[PDB]
Amino acid sequence: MYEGNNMRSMMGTSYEDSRLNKRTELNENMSIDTNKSEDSYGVQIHSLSKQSFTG
Amino acid sequence: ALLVAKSAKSALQDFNHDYSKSWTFGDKWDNSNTMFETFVNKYLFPKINETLLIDIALGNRFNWLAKEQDFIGQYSEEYVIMDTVPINMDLSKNEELMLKRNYPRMATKLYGNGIVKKQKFTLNNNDTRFNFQTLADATNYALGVYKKKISDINVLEEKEMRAMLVDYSLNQLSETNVRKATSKEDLASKVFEAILNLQNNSAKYNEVHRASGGAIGQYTTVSKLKDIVILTTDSLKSYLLDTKIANTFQIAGIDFTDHVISFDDLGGVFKVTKEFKLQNQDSIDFLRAYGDYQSQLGDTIPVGAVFTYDVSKLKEFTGNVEEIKPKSDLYAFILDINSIKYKRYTKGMLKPPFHNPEFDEVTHWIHYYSFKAISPFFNKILITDQ
Amino acid sequence: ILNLQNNSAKYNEVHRASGGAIGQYTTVSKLKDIVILTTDSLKSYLLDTKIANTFQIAGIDFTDHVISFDDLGGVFKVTKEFKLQNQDSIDFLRAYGDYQSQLGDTIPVGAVFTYDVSKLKEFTGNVEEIKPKSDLYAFILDINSIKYKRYTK
Amino acid sequence: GVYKKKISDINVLEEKEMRAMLVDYSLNQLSETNVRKATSKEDLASKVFEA
Amino acid sequence: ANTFQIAGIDFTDHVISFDDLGGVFKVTKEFKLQNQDSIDFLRAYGDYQSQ
């Protein structure tokens, strides 16, 4: 309403919002596409892969 | 005696003392009676070949409840109307009561603010280069500590909100809501009859007596089964899968497993009821072992404080803190969504870094506002052994 | 399973690491990575009685991820770091390809013996074995918790 | 909202008083020839199917 | 769920159910209202004609 200047580093143009990046979401799926116990029924072994996991 | 145990020529003697000696002449490294037995060469430095930094990001399982505010104001409020059954009209009464007033009565439960949570961390550029035999692994160290500083947000938020509805499932809702089971081979029939109670018009299954303006009265309501969830131990979901759906024949529309939020154990959390002060130094170290750096001696815990890890084994903390868990682990709390009011405000999540060059270590901060609450004006049934 | 995929400060042994005696560390798993380990009796009982004599199996069959053995022990550890004394001990040991261990060296306390060995007079008390103590056993884990590197160049 | 609850309450009132008078009838009317006696909870599964 | 041959026998097209079959009460030994607390309890359900 009041026009003013609206400008400071913080508390101007930093008081009402900021840049948003990430809301700490479920991307790793818990209880949708993992937390699974619904697997197949047949011949069996070796769905067991290994990455390097060095980073 | 041994040159390895001699700490006074290590790389920590030059960073606590302001003055140190500039050049060096080396050493005559040995492998005689160390942790570095070597058959062929007693005079070489132990070569390591790699390090790994294993790290997995962790979820929240509640991000479809993530409604977003704009962070203005601090009180919210909601209210229903009490139900009011009609009467038989008896004409022996006076002809003047139609002038008399009759206001409708309301519920009026009021909610305060949430809590803003925060965490900080410090990356050094000086001593960290003495480890990290390449340069990329230090960058992996940076992105790994950043990803754990966002994953812990998830695990603490799900743990605290799990704690809040389990804490609600004790000592808050009345005896017309709770029912008494006896076994895990019970409580599956009892949850199966407990569901499709709620699609009968009833006032026995809410808790509006715990509202402010509605202690006496009643309030009928229902639910819609795209809207209920059940909350239980993974043991019970294990029982439902291996026994109830497995050992029977035609359940082609009956298997209600899509509403089963289930956990390994329904408690790791602690709540202070008696107030006190902090005196033990190892208690301070144990708190900042989990990151609570702000705590000093002489500090004062409030009443409405949770603790989210096992903290009940300190001498300040015995007796006055309490674990929130079911007793006999035969536990099933069914509710309906629109009752739990989850909220967070996190657009200002990553604050700009502070550099501090004269110590040369950057420091970040993470802030987010979060508002847990649940609403009493819906349908809830708890199943336990008292 | 369904506990292995919860955010748990337990289920790991970070308290038995080097720098992590105090504190917590949460981890989950992915169902492409859980390995069951048990006897053949348990797996056999499963796939002839439970999943056979039940009706619905439509998603439940976790037998894809089970490894089993006829027994979980034929193997031995050392205690007390004993010494070689007897002729019959070493020449019994000769029968399994061992040649270098002559009468007069010691055995370190962390060695393994990999066959039925405890009946020698030097070994009783000094040598213990590795088995489940009750033959009713299932150790299940997240895979790539085990690491296994060999050099066969 | 107060108006639509002033019709919702007469709805729930009407239905539960009507099931109440049905139970009242079941206890106080229909002399012994009309009532059959089950024993167990699976007993009446057979009884209603034959009835 | 268990008796395996339902295509024909499913009589759950005609089953009215309820949580309880009674929360509704009945009066014997007629009386008079004589406590203020009792009528204040009745005011919390809409009954305003009571004295």
Tab-separated table of N, CA, C and O in Angstrom, chain B residues 144-182:
chain	number	residue	atom	x	y	z
B	144	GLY	N	27.975	-33.845	0.492
B	144	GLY	CA	27.434	-34.848	1.383
B	144	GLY	C	26.965	-34.266	2.698
B	144	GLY	O	25.918	-34.667	3.221
B	145	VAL	N	27.711	-33.301	3.244
B	145	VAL	CA	27.242	-32.715	4.489
B	145	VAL	C	26.036	-31.830	4.225
B	145	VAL	O	25.127	-31.764	5.054
B	146	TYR	N	25.932	-31.254	3.026
B	146	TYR	CA	24.738	-30.488	2.687
B	146	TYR	C	23.516	-31.391	2.542
B	146	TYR	O	22.420	-31.069	3.028
B	147	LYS	N	23.689	-32.538	1.890
B	147	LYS	CA	22.564	-33.447	1.745
B	147	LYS	C	22.167	-34.097	3.059
B	147	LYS	O	20.984	-34.388	3.253
B	148	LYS	N	23.098	-34.299	3.985
B	148	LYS	CA	22.636	-34.792	5.272
B	148	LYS	C	21.959	-33.686	6.067
B	148	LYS	O	20.962	-33.943	6.753
B	149	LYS	N	22.413	-32.439	5.917
B	149	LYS	CA	21.714	-31.341	6.569
B	149	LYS	C	20.361	-31.029	5.955
B	149	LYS	O	19.619	-30.239	6.541
B	150	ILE	N	20.012	-31.591	4.801
B	150	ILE	CA	18.601	-31.555	4.426
B	150	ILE	C	17.858	-32.852	4.744
B	150	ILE	O	16.630	-32.818	4.909
B	151	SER	N	18.552	-33.991	4.833
B	151	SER	CA	17.848	-35.242	5.108
B	151	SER	C	17.417	-35.330	6.563
B	151	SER	O	16.376	-35.929	6.884
B	152	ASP	N	18.208	-34.746	7.459
B	152	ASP	CA	17.856	-34.784	8.870
B	152	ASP	C	16.612	-33.962	9.163
B	152	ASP	O	15.883	-34.266	10.111
B	153	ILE	N	16.368	-32.926	8.353
B	153	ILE	CA	15.120	-32.171	8.407
B	153	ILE	C	13.940	-33.101	8.198
B	153	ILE	O	12.959	-33.073	8.951
B	154	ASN	N	14.047	-33.962	7.185
B	154	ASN	CA	12.989	-34.909	6.864
B	154	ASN	C	12.766	-35.890	7.997
B	154	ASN	O	11.622	-36.122	8.415
B	155	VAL	N	13.854	-36.459	8.518
B	155	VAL	CA	13.667	-37.514	9.507
B	155	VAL	C	13.181	-36.933	10.830
B	155	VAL	O	12.314	-37.526	11.485
B	156	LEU	N	13.615	-35.722	11.189
B	156	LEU	CA	13.111	-35.127	12.412
B	156	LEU	C	11.679	-34.664	12.247
B	156	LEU	O	10.900	-34.732	13.200
B	157	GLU	N	11.297	-34.225	11.048
B	157	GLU	CA	9.926	-33.775	10.892
B	157	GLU	C	8.950	-34.939	10.943
B	157	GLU	O	7.919	-34.852	11.626
B	158	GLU	N	9.286	-36.055	10.291
B	158	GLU	CA	8.395	-37.206	10.365
B	158	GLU	C	8.391	-37.803	11.762
B	158	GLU	O	7.343	-38.241	12.246
B	159	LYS	N	9.531	-37.758	12.456
B	159	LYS	CA	9.592	-38.333	13.789
B	159	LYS	C	8.810	-37.488	14.781
B	159	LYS	O	8.062	-38.022	15.606
B	160	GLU	N	8.927	-36.162	14.679
B	160	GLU	CA	8.186	-35.285	15.573
B	160	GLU	C	6.694	-35.338	15.293
B	160	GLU	O	5.896	-35.317	16.232
B	161	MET	N	6.291	-35.455	14.033
B	161	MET	CA	4.860	-35.469	13.791
B	161	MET	C	4.242	-36.815	14.148
B	161	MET	O	3.104	-36.847	14.650
B	162	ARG	N	4.982	-37.909	13.924
B	162	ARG	CA	4.608	-39.217	14.447
B	162	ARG	C	4.443	-39.175	15.953
B	162	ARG	O	3.463	-39.697	16.502
B	163	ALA	N	5.388	-38.521	16.628
B	163	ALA	CA	5.317	-38.324	18.063
B	163	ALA	C	4.089	-37.542	18.469
B	163	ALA	O	3.466	-37.861	19.481
B	164	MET	N	3.722	-36.525	17.693
B	164	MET	CA	2.588	-35.703	18.086
B	164	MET	C	1.276	-36.443	17.941
B	164	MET	O	0.419	-36.339	18.822
B	165	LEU	N	1.100	-37.239	16.885
B	165	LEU	CA	-0.183	-37.931	16.856
B	165	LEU	C	-0.217	-39.144	17.775
B	165	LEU	O	-1.301	-39.503	18.243
B	166	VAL	N	0.926	-39.763	18.079
B	166	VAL	CA	0.912	-40.822	19.085
B	166	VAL	C	0.661	-40.237	20.470
B	166	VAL	O	-0.111	-40.790	21.262
B	167	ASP	N	1.257	-39.078	20.753
B	167	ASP	CA	1.021	-38.377	22.008
B	167	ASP	C	-0.417	-37.910	22.103
B	167	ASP	O	-0.982	-37.818	23.196
B	168	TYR	N	-1.022	-37.601	20.965
B	168	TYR	CA	-2.442	-37.317	20.957
B	168	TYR	C	-3.244	-38.576	21.215
B	168	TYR	O	-4.323	-38.513	21.810
B	169	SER	N	-2.747	-39.718	20.755
B	169	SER	CA	-3.481	-40.961	20.917
B	169	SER	C	-3.436	-41.478	22.338
B	169	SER	O	-4.158	-42.425	22.659
B	170	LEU	N	-2.590	-40.912	23.175
B	170	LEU	CA	-2.706	-41.078	24.607
B	170	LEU	C	-3.284	-39.795	25.176
B	170	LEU	O	-3.351	-38.778	24.486
B	171	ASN	N	-3.835	-39.921	26.387
B	171	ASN	CA	-4.188	-38.863	27.352
B	171	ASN	C	-4.911	-37.651	26.752
B	171	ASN	O	-4.850	-36.554	27.311
B	172	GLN	N	-5.587	-37.803	25.615
B	172	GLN	CA	-6.208	-36.641	25.006
B	172	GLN	C	-7.633	-36.930	24.566
B	172	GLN	O	-8.499	-36.053	24.605
B	173	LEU	N	-7.893	-38.165	24.172
B	173	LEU	CA	-9.177	-38.551	23.615
B	173	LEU	C	-9.882	-39.510	24.563
B	173	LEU	O	-9.243	-40.307	25.253
B	174	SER	N	-11.206	-39.421	24.595
B	174	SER	CA	-11.980	-40.027	25.663
B	174	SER	C	-12.294	-41.492	25.383
B	174	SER	O	-12.024	-42.028	24.307
B	175	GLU	N	-12.898	-42.140	26.379
B	175	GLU	CA	-13.064	-43.585	26.407
B	175	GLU	C	-14.103	-44.095	25.425
B	175	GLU	O	-14.120	-45.295	25.137
B	176	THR	N	-14.966	-43.230	24.910
B	176	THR	CA	-15.849	-43.642	23.835
B	176	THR	C	-15.116	-43.817	22.516
B	176	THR	O	-15.642	-44.475	21.615
B	177	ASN	N	-13.917	-43.260	22.387
B	177	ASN	CA	-13.125	-43.425	21.183
B	177	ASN	C	-12.271	-44.676	21.237
B	177	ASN	O	-12.229	-45.441	20.270
B	178	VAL	N	-11.597	-44.896	22.343
B	178	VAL	CA	-10.649	-45.992	22.473
B	178	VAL	C	-11.413	-47.293	22.666
B	178	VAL	O	-12.486	-47.323	23.278
B	179	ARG	N	-10.904	-48.362	22.068
B	179	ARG	CA	-11.426	-49.697	22.283
B	179	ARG	C	-10.292	-50.615	22.714
B	179	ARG	O	-9.112	-50.323	22.516
B	180	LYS	N	-10.669	-51.744	23.301
B	180	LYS	CA	-9.739	-52.646	23.964
B	180	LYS	C	-9.628	-53.931	23.164
B	180	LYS	O	-10.596	-54.691	23.075
B	181	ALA	N	-8.456	-54.179	22.597
B	181	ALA	CA	-8.160	-55.446	21.950
B	181	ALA	C	-7.419	-56.346	22.927
B	181	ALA	O	-7.248	-56.017	24.102
B	182	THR	N	-6.995	-57.509	22.439
B	182	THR	CA	-6.220	-58.405	23.288
B	182	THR	C	-5.013	-59.050	22.620
B	182	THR	O	-4.098	-59.456	23.342
